[PDB]
Design an enzyme around this catalytic site. Structure first.
Site, short mmCIF file in Angstrom:
data_model
loop_
_atom_site.label_atom_id
_atom_site.label_comp_id
_atom_site.label_asym_id
_atom_site.label_seq_id
_atom_site.Cartn_x
_atom_site.Cartn_y
_atom_site.Cartn_z
N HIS A 154 1.66 9.12 1.72
CA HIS A 154 0.67 8.98 0.68
C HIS A 154 1.00 9.94 -0.44
O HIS A 154 1.38 11.08 -0.12
CB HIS A 154 -0.77 9.29 1.20
CG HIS A 154 -1.16 8.48 2.40
ND1 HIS A 154 -1.92 7.32 2.30
CD2 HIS A 154 -0.82 8.61 3.71
CE1 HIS A 154 -2.13 6.85 3.54
NE2 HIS A 154 -1.41 7.57 4.39
N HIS A 196 0.85 -1.18 0.00
CA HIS A 196 0.00 0.00 0.00
C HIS A 196 0.90 1.24 0.00
O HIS A 196 0.66 2.17 -0.83
CB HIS A 196 -0.98 -0.04 1.18
CG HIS A 196 -1.78 -1.33 1.24
ND1 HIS A 196 -2.68 -1.69 0.26
CD2 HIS A 196 -1.77 -2.33 2.15
CE1 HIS A 196 -3.24 -2.84 0.59
NE2 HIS A 196 -2.70 -3.26 1.72
N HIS A 214 5.03 6.83 7.33
CA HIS A 214 4.82 6.45 5.97
C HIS A 214 4.28 7.71 5.25
O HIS A 214 4.02 8.75 5.89
CB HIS A 214 3.83 5.28 5.79
CG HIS A 214 2.49 5.61 6.35
ND1 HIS A 214 2.17 5.38 7.68
CD2 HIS A 214 1.45 6.27 5.82
CE1 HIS A 214 0.95 5.87 7.92
NE2 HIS A 214 0.48 6.39 6.79
N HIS A 263 2.77 10.81 7.44
CA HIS A 263 2.06 10.43 8.63
C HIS A 263 3.03 9.80 9.63
O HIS A 263 3.61 8.76 9.28
CB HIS A 263 0.95 9.43 8.27
CG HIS A 263 -0.20 10.13 7.58
ND1 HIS A 263 -1.14 9.48 6.79
CD2 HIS A 263 -0.49 11.45 7.54
CE1 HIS A 263 -2.00 10.38 6.32
NE2 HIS A 263 -1.60 11.59 6.73
N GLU A 321 -3.88 13.39 1.58
CA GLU A 321 -5.19 12.83 2.06
C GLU A 321 -5.98 14.06 2.64
O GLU A 321 -7.05 14.44 2.13
CB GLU A 321 -4.90 11.79 3.15
CG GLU A 321 -4.25 10.57 2.43
CD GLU A 321 -4.35 9.28 3.20
OE1 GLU A 321 -4.08 9.29 4.44
OE2 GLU A 321 -4.90 8.34 2.57
N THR A 360 -6.67 6.22 8.00
CA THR A 360 -7.16 6.47 6.62
C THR A 360 -7.08 5.21 5.72
O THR A 360 -7.35 5.32 4.52
CB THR A 360 -6.35 7.61 6.00
OG1 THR A 360 -5.01 7.21 5.77
CG2 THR A 360 -6.47 8.86 6.81
N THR A 361 -6.53 4.11 6.24
CA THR A 361 -6.56 2.80 5.51
C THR A 361 -7.39 1.83 6.34
O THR A 361 -7.42 1.93 7.58
CB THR A 361 -5.16 2.22 5.36
OG1 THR A 361 -4.50 2.17 6.66
CG2 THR A 361 -4.31 3.17 4.41
C1 LIG Z 1 -4.48 -5.60 14.91
O1 LIG Z 1 -3.70 -4.46 14.86
C2 LIG Z 1 -3.88 -3.39 13.83
N1 LIG Z 1 -5.08 -2.79 13.89
C3 LIG Z 1 -5.45 -1.81 13.07
N2 LIG Z 1 -4.65 -1.36 12.13
C4 LIG Z 1 -3.44 -1.88 11.96
N3 LIG Z 1 -2.65 -1.36 10.91
C5 LIG Z 1 -2.97 -0.09 10.41
C6 LIG Z 1 -1.95 0.84 11.07
C7 LIG Z 1 -2.22 2.18 10.46
C8 LIG Z 1 -1.54 3.27 11.00
C9 LIG Z 1 -1.75 4.57 10.48
C10 LIG Z 1 -2.60 4.83 9.41
S1 LIG Z 1 -2.80 6.53 8.76
N4 LIG Z 1 -2.65 6.34 7.12
O2 LIG Z 1 -4.17 6.97 9.15
O3 LIG Z 1 -1.58 7.31 9.38
C11 LIG Z 1 -3.27 3.71 8.86
C12 LIG Z 1 -3.09 2.38 9.36
C13 LIG Z 1 -2.97 -2.94 12.81
N5 LIG Z 1 -1.56 -3.47 12.56
O4 LIG Z 1 -1.23 -3.97 11.36
O5 LIG Z 1 -0.73 -3.47 13.41
ZN LIG Z 2 -1.25 7.45 6.43
#
Ligand SMILES: COc1ncnc(NCCc2ccc(S(N)(=O)=O)cc2)c1[N+](=O)[O-]
Ligand SMILES: [Zn+2]
Length: 258
Positions: A94, A62, A92, A117, A104, A196-197
């Site tokens: 976008h 992604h 990371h 982010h 975003e 946001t994902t």
């Molecule tokens: C069960 O645990 C988990 N639970 C939820 N999401 C996870 N991964 C998403 C983490 C993420 C961080 C930041 C952003 S953003 N783009 O909003 O900054 C998006 C997703 C995980 N995990 O894989 O650890």
């Molecule tokens: Zn992000």
């Protein structure tokens, strides 16, 4: 057929697997700078990155994550709108297929070339996985990128990307200093929102800096050479991995400045 950013699995499709996509506090949002309220009780943001320990960089299909050792209080975000202490776990970006889009969040409908982010989790919850299940579990610091002069402190990240071209590749990524990615001013807007994902969890206090950083055309071109697909699959360039602005619904955006 899992989620992604294409016609058939992109953001318009996410609500089928992740119904909270149409929830009451989704991110990103358009930041209407005239409607954001100046809040003189907001504190300066405290960004304490002096001891950050990067470990690794990973292409997850992604985006690419720069991951940190978050097993000790070493790189913490606090003050600003936050109660308590949030620990840096990864950053990371976008970005777009063209310099005219990629962020975003938007500012009075303006899209930036990219958005950084820095993801932090509330230490009261003991770890990231528990934190995402809480409404104040994460604080994500968002920083816009425009194209112009190079950001010298980004170059170490850009130079390792050809080693993680495709989904599931990772590399050694130690001694990266994220202070090199910060603009001069910590003036910010803040609002309650989500990842946001997928899984799109409503666990984020968003802190978006007003001042963008400048990155060169060459630096963002290297982001666009990454791949969504794995090694030995048809090449799909990693571009336009941003979710568009979502409805503000029942929320206020606060400004730390006039
Ligand atoms: C069960 O645990 C988990 N639970 C939820 N999401 C996870 N991964 C998403 C983490 C993420 C961080 C930041 C952003 S953003 N783009 O909003 O900054 C998006 C997703 C995980 N995990 O894989 O650890
Ligand atoms: Zn992000």
């Amino acid at each position: 057929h899992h989620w992604g950013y294409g016609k058939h699995n992109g953001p318009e499709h996410w609500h089928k697997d992740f119904p909270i996509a149409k929830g009451e506090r989704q991110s990103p949002v358009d930041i209407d700078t005239h409607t954001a309220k100046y809040d003189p009780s907001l504190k300066p943001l405290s960004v304490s990155y002096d001891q950050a320990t990067s470990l690794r960089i990973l292409n997850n299909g992604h985006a690419f994550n720069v991951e940190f050792d978050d097993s000790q209080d070493k790189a913490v975000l606090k003050g600003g709108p936050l109660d308590g202490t949030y620990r840096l776990i990864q950053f990371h970006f976008h970005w777009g297929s063209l310099d005219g889009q990629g962020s975003e969040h938007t500012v009075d409908k303006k899209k930036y070339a990219a958005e950084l982010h820095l993801v932090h989790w509330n230490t009261k919850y003991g770890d990231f996985g528990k934190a995402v299940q809480q409404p104040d579990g994460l604080a994500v610091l968002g920083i816009f990128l425009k194209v112009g002069s190079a950001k010298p402190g980004l170059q170490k990240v850009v130079d390792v990307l050809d080693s993680i071209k495709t989904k599931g590749k990772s590399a050694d990524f130690t001694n990266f200093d994220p202070r090199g990615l910060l603009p001069e001013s910590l003036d910010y807007w803040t609002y309650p929102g989500s990842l946001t994902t997928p899984p799109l969890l409503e666990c984020v206090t968003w802190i978006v800096l007003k001042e963008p950083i400048s990155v060169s055309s060459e630096q963002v071109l290297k982001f666009r050479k990454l791949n969504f697909n794995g090694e030995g699959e048809p090449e799909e360039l990693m571009v336009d991995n941003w979710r568009p602005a979502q409805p503000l619904k029942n929320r206020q955006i606060k400004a730390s400045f006039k």
